[PDB]
């Protein structure tokens, strides 16, 4: 499946460079947009993201394996929009920065996998209707 593979590459690349702190065509443009929008969501919701992090209490690989639960339950209100999706990915980047400080860099890849899994499994039809990553770039064009 091209959609899962493409989504995974974008989200994992974004989470890895956000943890490292150094920036590394359709996927390329989606990454540029995600860096602009994602870094913005992280700055604007920094206090709210800090509160969610403490409540989740991610300290090891086993906490990352159980992180998918909250993500499925937040999407249980029947609301889907690019704003919610980019907030989920930006929160994933925030968790990936915290994982890097507690020497849990190895947890970024499964975290990226978990975010992609929840996204592509529960919202495949919506993502496809929205022109996937082309639509993501177009929606956030400024």
């Amino acid at each position, epitope marked *: 499946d091209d959609l899962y593979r493409q989504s995974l590459e974008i989200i994992s690349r974004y989470l890895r460079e956000q943890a490292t702190g150094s920036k590394d065509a*359709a996927g390329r*443009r989606a990454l540029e947009t995600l860096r602009r929008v994602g870094d913005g969501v992280q700055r604007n919701h920094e206090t709210a993201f800090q509160g969610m992090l403490r409540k989740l209490d991610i300290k090891n690989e086993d906490d990352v394996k159980s992180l998918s639960r909250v993500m499925i339950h937040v999407f249980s209100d029947g609301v889907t929009n690019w704003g919610r999706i980019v907030t989920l990915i930006s929160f994933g980047a925030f968790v990936a920065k915290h994982l890097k400080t507690i020497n849990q860099e190895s947890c970024i890849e499964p975290l990226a996998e978990s975010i992609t899994d929840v996204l592509v499994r529960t919202k495949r039809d919506w993502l496809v209707k929205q*022109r*996937g*990553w*082309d639509g993501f770039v*177009e929606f956030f064009h400024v």
Partner: single-chain antibody, 228 residues
Framework: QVTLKESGGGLVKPGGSLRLSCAASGFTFSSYSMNWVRQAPGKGLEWVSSISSSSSYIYYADSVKGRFTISRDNAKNSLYLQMNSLRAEDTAVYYC????????????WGQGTLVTVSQSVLTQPPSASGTPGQRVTISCSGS????????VNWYQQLPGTAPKLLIYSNNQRPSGVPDRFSGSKSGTSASLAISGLQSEDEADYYC???????????FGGGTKLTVL
């Protein structure tokens, strides 16, 4: 100056081929989905095809599948329509239209290019009328997969002109549209209201929405508004 300009139109024999071009100016072309919409002389708007920013998602109207191919060259700010196996029914002015990423409204349209080679899912009343200052209402009837699932856009087409975005996201006005125009959506229906009718409101009005079952844009048959 944000513009689109279509080229390549002309006279062709049935069975013949013709390639249209659309030149984009004053914007980042690589960040927009683009569309072709055609209009047979004296008839309504018919959506033809659309292509996303990185060409990953392409759609065609049933009437052109297999015969027409849409493409784009972002390095040349260019949209193309390769038309093969042309039929008399393909005779029309072909418009290039930019799609807004956040709303899917067609905010910029070219002047059109005439192609001479020699049913609408949304319905509207064919005519509407009023005296100056009166209030007129134009309905747009659809169903679950289109108006029932997606927002409605309205276009105004003055005589001899290209269509212009009038309303988007059911009831939002772009800049330059007077507040006498308003829109509403209820169930599978939508409506355009014009308060205090003015002479310049004499035009053809079209509603349009995305259809999830057809995977196509569907335009209403249009309403010819006369100001008596």
């Amino acid at each position: 100056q944000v513009t689109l300009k279509e080229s390549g139109g002309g006279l062709v024999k049935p069975g013949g081929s013709l390639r249209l071009s659309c030149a984009a100016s004053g914007f980042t072309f690589s960040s927009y989905s683009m569309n072709w919409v055609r209009q047979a002389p004296g008839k309504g708007l018919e959506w033809v095809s659309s292509i996303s920013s990185s060409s990953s998602y392409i759609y065609y109207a049933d009437s052109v599948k297999g015969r027409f191919t849409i493409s784009r060259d972002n390095a040349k700010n260019s949209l193309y329509l390769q038309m093969n196996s042309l039929r008399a029914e393909d005779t029309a002015v072909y418009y290039c239209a930019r799609q807004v990423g956040a709303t899917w409204a067609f905010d910029i349209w070219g002047q059109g290019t005439l192609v001479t080679v020699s049913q609408s899912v949304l319905t509207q009343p064919p005519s509407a009328s009023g005296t100056p200052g009166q209030r007129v209402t134009i309905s747009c009837s659809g169903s679950s997969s289109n108006i029932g699932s997606n927002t409605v856009n309205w276009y105004q087409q003055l005589p001899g002109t290209a269509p212009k975005l009038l309303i988007y996201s059911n009831n939002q006005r772009p800049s330059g549209v007077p507040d006498r125009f308003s829109g509403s959506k209820s169930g599978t229906s939508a409506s355009l209201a014009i308060s205090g009718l003015q002479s310049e409101d004499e035009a053809d009005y079209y509603c349009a929405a995305w259809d999830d079952s057809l995977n196509a844009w569907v335009f209403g048959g249009g309403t010819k508004l006369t100001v008596l």
